[model samples]
Target: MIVIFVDFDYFFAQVEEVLNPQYKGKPLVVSVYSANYEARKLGVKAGMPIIKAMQIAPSAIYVPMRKPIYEAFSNRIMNLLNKHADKIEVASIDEAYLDVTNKVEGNFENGIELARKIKQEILEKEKITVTVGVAPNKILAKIIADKSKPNGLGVIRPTEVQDFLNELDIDEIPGIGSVLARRLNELGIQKLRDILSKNYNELEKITGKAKALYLLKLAQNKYSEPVENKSKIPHGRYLTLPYNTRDVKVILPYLKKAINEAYNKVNGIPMRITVIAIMEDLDILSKGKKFKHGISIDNAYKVAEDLLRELLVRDKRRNVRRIGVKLDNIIIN
Candidate 1:
């Protein structure tokens, strides 16, 4: 089976540059109206205030983001992907999962052809580029896509998963965050194989089977799962709130409304919330936060609110530029 993940690198910026060649090859920063482009160039990443970006690259071009444009581009790409896969999982507006399982064809190479065709068609029809990763399962496919970069394709088979992972930086594993990496670094677990060989059973116990093992397996490229899917979109939404509002006053309410909207669509119980901010670049995302007692809608909303407000405090400028919210951790039953 062949599963593929395609991610549009610097999606918003690419959308702007694609329609107008003048923006190509420039240090492009996509932001909402409040972005401080000069700051963005300096050192501030996407979610950083524009003023910060200026210090990083004083001459970089800063463009306001357009949702319709990006969505249109995404739709066009999805149409192209539909041509090859039995099922597609749109991971994000910027990426997707394609099931090119062998059950449907002679070889997985056909997925490669389809991926290339998808890229070519998007460039020709939409004038945008994408990076695609082909693997025996989801995590590896995503990692392969990451390796492919701005415009490339990568392939990893089931057996090669561990081998491919061994050669990758432990940090390359999706869930290996800075803190986890730091701990692993302290423990001298620099490679994925180190994760497998180490004595982190206690640590794994704390994180639980889902993430503890998930980390080691993905780090080692040994994780695998069924490829049969039909573009599972659990719950997705985007919302912006004013800077002055506290979590209780504004941000929290907005989140609850958005979460409810998402729930309406997925027929799911909210397992987790992925809080995103659009002040400059993609900023802090809180995947899972434990509830004092147990998970509840209120607890989840509070977690999302807590993450962004903390960001606002940390941001030197004290500006709440923009925010995006994604609800994952879905369950079908």
Candidate 2:
């Protein structure tokens, strides 16, 4: 089987550029989301507060969050991908995984050709460019797509998997973060190939057994996870506060109101609860937890409260401009 990962290039900022061509080739920053390459060159980054971004790129053009337009564009791209994919998984608003084994006939050359066609079609139709990665599995495809960004295509055939894995840094794997990378680096394990030298016990000491085993399997190109094309529409509500405040009492009522409204709209129970806070500087913060069994409306509120508190603690200013609750992975009993 072959999987192809498609990621829109700097999605929100790119969309703004497409709509206002005058902003093209200038430092453009999408509020609370992403920055164009021009803004990135000035040390402005995604998720940085607009206040900080302004400090970094004083001349940059800042666009407010236009969720509706972004979602419309995303839907158009997903519709196009559906036409070419045997099965499709929308990973986010701007990315998806396509199980195109049948479409590509499980051949690497055909996969590359298909990716090129998809890229060109999206560009011509939507006036936006995308990066695509074609590989034997989902993780490799996503990794390659991430590396080939801003409109590029990367391919990894079955025969080339080992060479590709050998050259990758340990942090390139999906779940390996800076802490894990630092731990591995301290133990002289910097590259994916370095993991092969350690025994199961040694790796287990560094990462838990399951992660260690997964890493080992991945290094050998033996790990396999299929693309699950599940419908995952998130239901929730958000409110911009009448005034930005740091008090939990002021925030809790709005959160409860949003959560109740969200619960009322859904018939099934939620397996995941998420909370979002837009800070005074327009920096967005979110936290989510998944339960093996679905949770009740009351429990969902309690979870949101805790998550909100957690988010508040992380906010140096401790003030929020907007707050929201989201329920996802709903299942009917």
**Top of the candidates by TM-score:** 2
Candidate 1 per-residue lDDT, tens place, 1-333, comes to: 688788886777777777767855666777676322233344557555666565457677667678877887787787677666776666667878778775347376677777777778777877777888878788888877887675878888666766787787767767667677777677777876776666667557444557777876676555776653333444567667765443446566766776667656654455556665554443543433433233456666667777766656665544344455665544422
lDDT tens readout by residue for model 2, 87-191: 887777888888899876777788889988999999889989999999999989988987878688888898889899989998777877678888999999989
Query: Per-model C-alpha lDDT, please?
Result: 0.65, 0.85
Q: Over all chains combined, what TM-score does candidate 1 have? A: 0.66
Model 2 spans > 4 angstroms off: 208-210, 231-233, 237-333
Report the error of model 2 at residue 150, Å: 2.2
RMSD each, Å: 9.2, 7.0
Off by over 4 Å in 1: 33-44, 103-106, 205-209, 219-222, 227-333
Error of 1 at 323 (Å): 21
Give the range of the ten consecutive residues with the poorest summed lDDT in model 1.
285-294
What's the number of clashes in each of the models? 25, 0
